[model samples]
Target: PLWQVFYLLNTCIKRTGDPTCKKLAKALRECLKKGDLKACNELADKAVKYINSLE
Candidate 1:
């Protein structure tokens, strides 16, 4: 729920070809496959922080 909006733009971020951010996006997709919602949330926190760092 936290990174829903940002995750939607994952394709765009991937398209940007930034390995740092792309891997997080990709990681979310991978982590999301698990039943662990909280893990994905943890990654979302990282994603937000990393994106913040980028911008």
Candidate 2:
């Protein structure tokens, strides 16, 4: 995985101390679990925004 993706997933981890990104992470995870690749990709993009938006 790319560093960005790895960082995103790492931040999404339960004890990563980033509850703000957790929702986006869980949404992406659930989308992937449902085999919705397109949705997952879109969520990943949105998650990027969420991550970037962090100070």
Candidate 3:
């Protein structure tokens, strides 16, 4: 049931490097369900930067 693009990212994030550069891993996950949509997006910005930073 990988319908959410968000989930896919975390799945990789989890397996990508649990011991390194995991800042983007848990940051956005909790940031999303919280009381701030704008806050969440800001977190997402940082999140993508890391994993994508692997680029």
Candidate 4:
């Protein structure tokens, strides 16, 4: 459900309007378009770090 991950990340971006979220969202979109799961996972981890930072 990688696409779902992308969808939720994008949804998060739309809801939060945070620069970090936008960066993560854009990175996800680019990697998804290029069919690069390695990059996608890296970005996903980055997004997770950002999320964790919020707490």
Task: Give the candidate number with the greatest TM-score.
Answer: 4
Model 4 stretches astray by more than 4 angstroms? 1-12
- The C-alpha TM-scores of every prediction are 0.69, 0.65, 0.51, 0.72
Quote the positional error of residue 18 for candidate 4 in Å: 0.5
RMSD of each: 2.5, 3.0, 3.9, 2.2
lDDT per residue for candidate 2 within 1-55, as digits (tens), equals 3357647766565456686576766676687679898887787777777767763
Better of 1 and 4 by lDDT: 4
- Please give, for residues 1-55, the per-residue lDDT of candidate 3 as tens digits: 2124356466665676543345544555566657666766766655556556566
Q: 1 or 3, which is superior by TM-score? A: 1
Rank the candidate models, highest lDDT first. 4, 1, 2, 3
Ten-residue stretch with the least lDDT total in model 2: 1-10
Best by lDDT: 4
Candidate 1 lDDT over 1-55, as tens digits, reads 6556366447447667777776777777777677578878888888777766666
Q: Worst ten-residue run, lDDT, model 4?
A: 1-10
In candidate 4 the C-alpha lDDT for residue 50 amounts to 73
